[PDB]
Design a protein around this ligand. Structure first.
Ligand code: RJE
Length: 155
């Protein structure tokens, strides 16, 4: 059907991953990555950089696309086509805002119970830097009715 473009950025380093507790708005009460809608006149990668900076205060040397996930929320007018980026190359410190509190998690302490339920499926691939295409059919924000996830050579 009709779909909208989104980006999702994970700051993933050898020993730790950066997530942000949402205090308000989309994903409130969960540890989320950084992202949002891609705008007209910017590339998907430019949009990922922009959202990372707007949300966390971070600027990076480079980012790479590691996956794509299509979300179907039952009853919503459009699909969400999310392009997933990864980067280790931060140039400063994350900053807490009125919207978000940043936290570095050790890789054996990733808080899946306090994250979106789909994350449990594709994180093991992200952590191995294995590229992936996924699809998740949701009923509301807690329930996965169906999904697919495959390792790909090209996103
Ligand atoms: C780290 N896992 C996840 N992080 C976010 O950060 C929000 C920034 O992206 C807009 N969102 C996640 C997320 N895992 C997850 O399911 N979502 C929900 C989502 C659904 C549809 C479009 C975008 C995000």
């Amino acid at each position: 059907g009709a779909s909208r473009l989104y980006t999702l950025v994970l700051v993933l380093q050898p020993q730790r991953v950066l997530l942000g507790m949402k205090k308000r708005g989309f994903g409130a009460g969960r540890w989320n990555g950084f992202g949002g809608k891609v705008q007209e006149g910017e590339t998907i990668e430019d949009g990922a950089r922009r959202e990372l900076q707007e949300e966390s205060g971070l600027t990076v040397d480079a980012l790479h696309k590691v996956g794509q996930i299509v979300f179907e929320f039952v009853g919503e007018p459009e699909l969400m086509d999310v392009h997933v980026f990864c980067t280790d190359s931060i140039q400063g410190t994350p900053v807490e805002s009125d919207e978000m509190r940043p936290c570095w998690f050790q890789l054996d302490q990733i808080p899946f119970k306090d994250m979106w339920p789909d994350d449990s499926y594709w994180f093991p691939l992200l952590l191995q830097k294995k590229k992936f295409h996924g699809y998740f059919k949701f009923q509301g924000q807690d329930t996965i009715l169906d999904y697919t996830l495959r390792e790909v050579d090209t996103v």
